[PDB]
Amino acid sequence: PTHDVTTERSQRLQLRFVPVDREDTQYSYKTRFQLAVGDNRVLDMASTYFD
Amino acid sequence: PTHDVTTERSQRLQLRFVPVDREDTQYSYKTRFQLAVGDNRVLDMASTYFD
Amino acid sequence: DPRHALRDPERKFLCDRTLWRIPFSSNFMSMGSLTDLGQNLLYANAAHALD
Amino acid sequence: DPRHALRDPERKFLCDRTLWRIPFSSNFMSMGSLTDLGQNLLYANAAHALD
Amino acid sequence: EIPTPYVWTFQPQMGAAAGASQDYSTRMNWFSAGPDMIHDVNNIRDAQNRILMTQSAIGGIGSRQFVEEFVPAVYLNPYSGPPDSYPDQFIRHYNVYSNSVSG
Amino acid sequence: FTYSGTIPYLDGTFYLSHTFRKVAIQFDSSVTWPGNDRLLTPNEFEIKISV
Amino acid sequence: FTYSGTIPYLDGTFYLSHTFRKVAIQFDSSVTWPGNDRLLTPNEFEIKISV
C-alpha cells in the first residue's frame, strides 16, 4: 500500500522517558514516568520495557 | 499563521558542502561543489557564502 | 618583526546589555505575537514537561 | 573470590552467515515485494544521487 | 497570451506518465532578430499551439496509446485562476488522493 | 544586600552573556526541541565552541 | 587466487558483520535517509557503540 499506512511527517519510532521521580529505599526502588502518547498515535504496551 | 508556512518533517536549516574537487595552483585556488537543492525546497543564493 | 616568536591565535566576543533569545517558532522568525507553535494543538491539547 | 582484583566489563557479539538489512520501506516492515517507498512519486518522477 | 506547451515524459513503469514541463530543447531563439521578425515568430508559434489545440481535443497506458493521448497541452495565460485551480497534475512529484509529498 | 552598583536585574545592564557554552531543551524528557534536525547540532544550541 | 577455503561471496558463509560501526545514507548529497527523525540517531544507523 502507498497511503493510509505510514505518515509522511517527522516522528520518532521509539521514544525514551526519564524518571520524573525516583526513591531508592533500603530494599526497594521506585520510579514514576509520565508516559505521554502524542496525538494521532497509538502505543502497544507490549513494545515497552524498562531499561 | 499555523499552516502553509513551515514544514513538520525533519529538515536542516543550513547545509554544509565539501569540495568534490580542488586544485591548489601556484597563484590560484579552485574548488567545485555540487550544490544540491532537495525537492520541495528553495534556496536563496544571498544566504550562501564560502567558509 | 623578524624577531617574532611562534605564537597562537585566540578568539572570543562580548555582548552586553542584551538578552539571548530563542523564539518558540518553527522557523525562529517573528510572524506575530502569538507564534505558530504557540498555537499548535500538540501543546494546547495536552500538557508536557520541560527540562 | 576474596582474592579477586578490580576488573572491567567488555561486551561484543557475533552474527555469521547473515546479511545486514535495511529495507526501503517507510516503517522498515515488509508489506509486499514492491515496497511503498519504492512506488512513491518522489522517486519514479525524478532521478536522484546516492551516497 | 501565447505561451509554450508542456511536455509529458512517459514513465516505463506504472504507465501513469509524469510531470509535464515547458519544453526548452526546441526553443526557437530569436531575440536577436528584427521587429517584423519578432512579429512573425509569435505568429507561426501561435499556429503551432493552434494545431496542438485541435490535436489535443481529438492500469497504465502503453507508449503507443500514450502518443495519441497526454498530448502537449497549452496552459494559456499563467497561474491566472485562483489558488484553487492550478496546474497541479503538471507537477512531477504530485499525487491525486493527497497533496504533493515525498520522503 | 551589601551592593550599590547597577542592578542588571532591574536597569538591564547585563554583561555575562559571553559566559555560556550550550543550551539543551527537551519536552517530556525525551523529545528534544526543536529537533527535526534543524541545526548543524540538532541535539542542542551551541553558543560557542572552544576547539 | 591462491585460496581454496569457503568463498563467502558464493556459498554465503559470511562472518564479518560484527565489524561495522555505522552507516550513513543520503540522497542528492543533502537529504539524509530515512530522516524525519525516525531513529534515536536520525543522522545515521549506529550498528554498535563502544562508549
> Chains near A, with 3+ CB pairs < 8 A?
B, C, D, E, F, G
Distance (Å) of CA C51 to CA A38, C48, E18, F30: 18, 10, 48, 9
How was it solved?
cryo-EM
> Chains near E, with 3+ CB pairs < 8 A?
A, B, D, G
3-state secondary structure of A47: helix
Distance (Å) of CA A8 to CA A4, D26, E17, G37: 10, 8, 23, 11
* Cα dihedral sign, A36-A40-A46-A51: negative
Q: Beta strands B21-24 and A29-32: pairing type?
A: unpaired
**Main-chain dihedrals φ then ψ at residue E53, nearest 5 degrees:** -80, -45
Asked if F30 is an interface residue toward chain G (Cβ–Cβ < 8 A), one would say no
Cell, residue C25: 517558532
Which residues of chain C have a CB within 8 Å of the CB of A34? 49
Helix or strand holding residue E40 (H, E) = helix E35-57
3-state secondary structure of B10: coil
Give the resolution in Å. 4.5
- Closest-approach residue (CA) in chain F for G42: F37
Asked if D38 is an interface residue toward chain A (Cβ–Cβ < 8 A), one would say no
Question: Quick check: do G and F touch, 3+ CB pairs under 8 A?
Answer: yes
Contacts 24+ apart (CB under 8 A), D13-22: D13/G18, D13/G48, D14/G15, D14/G18, D15/G17, D15/G18, D16/G13, D16/G14, D16/G15, D16/G17, D17/G12, D17/G13, D17/G14, D17/G15, D18/G14, D18/G17, D19/G14, D19/G17, D20/G17, D20/G20, D20/G47, D22/G23, D22/G25, D22/G45
Asked if B6 is an interface residue toward chain A (Cβ–Cβ < 8 A), one would say no
> Do F29 and A18 meet the contact criterion of CB atoms below 8 Å apart?
yes
CA neighbor of E96 nearest in space, from D32, A3, D25? A3
How many angstroms away from the CA of E46 is the closest CA of chain D?
A: 30
The answer to whether the Cβ–Cβ distance between D49 and G17 falls below 8 Å is no
Distance (Å) of CA B8 to CA B3, D43, E44, G18: 10, 21, 48, 36
Q: What angle do CA G29, G32, G35 make, to 5 degrees?
A: 165
> Do E51 and E100 meet the contact criterion of CB atoms below 8 Å apart?
no
How many angstroms away from the CA of F7 is the closest CA of chain A?
A: 36
Alpha-carbon span F46 to F20, nearest angstrom: 9
Helix or strand holding residue F26 (H, E) = strand F25-27
CA neighbor of A11 nearest in space, from A33, A32, A49, A42? A42
Q: In sequence order, which residues have a C-beta less than 8 Å from that of residue D50 and are 6 or more positions away?
A: G25, G26, G27
Residues pairing with E6 in the sheet: E22
Which residues of chain G have a CB within 8 Å of the CB of E102? none
- Interface mutation vs chain B, best among G26, G30, G39, G41, most B CBs within 10 Å: G30
Q: Beta strands E21-22 and E6-7: pairing type?
A: antiparallel
Asked if G37 is an interface residue toward chain F (Cβ–Cβ < 8 A), one would say yes
Alpha-carbon span F30 to F47, nearest angstrom: 22
Identify the burial level of E84 via C-beta atoms within 10 angstroms of its C-beta, where 0-12 means exposed, 13-18 middle and 19 or more buried.
Answer: exposed
The answer to whether the Cβ–Cβ distance between F28 and A16 falls below 8 Å is no
